[PDB]
């Protein structure tokens, strides 16, 4: 699909509100597998189960291992831009 950029806003105590699968070692992009109700991704709208996360706040995730992506995603704070495409 077309690339979309979605702005999440999260408070300092919460997670992003997604589950992710995939990554370089699995031969597929980082993929959103769940969007958790009431958490930041859900509140933003515009994200979907099945979206690939190509980048977060300008960090390219297209060639990162799963745990590297988890770590980068976990470090984001406040206003967070996701670059996604529905695969």
């Amino acid at each position: 699909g077309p690339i979309r950029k979605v702005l999440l806003l999260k408070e300092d105590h919460e997670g992003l509100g997604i589950s992710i699968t995939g990554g370089k070692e699995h031969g597929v992009p980082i993929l959103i597998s769940e969007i958790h109700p009431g958490q930041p991704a859900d509140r933003a709208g515009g994200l979907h189960v099945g979206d690939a996360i190509l980048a977060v706040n300008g960090v390219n995730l297209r060639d990162t291992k799963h745990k590297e992506a988890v770590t980068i995603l976990s470090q984001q704070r406040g206003e967070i831009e996701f670059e996604v495409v529905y695969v």
Binding site: S19, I20, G22, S33
Partner: peptide, 6 residues
Amino acid sequence: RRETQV
């Protein structure tokens, strides 16, 4: 399956 909540 590898899956992580973040």
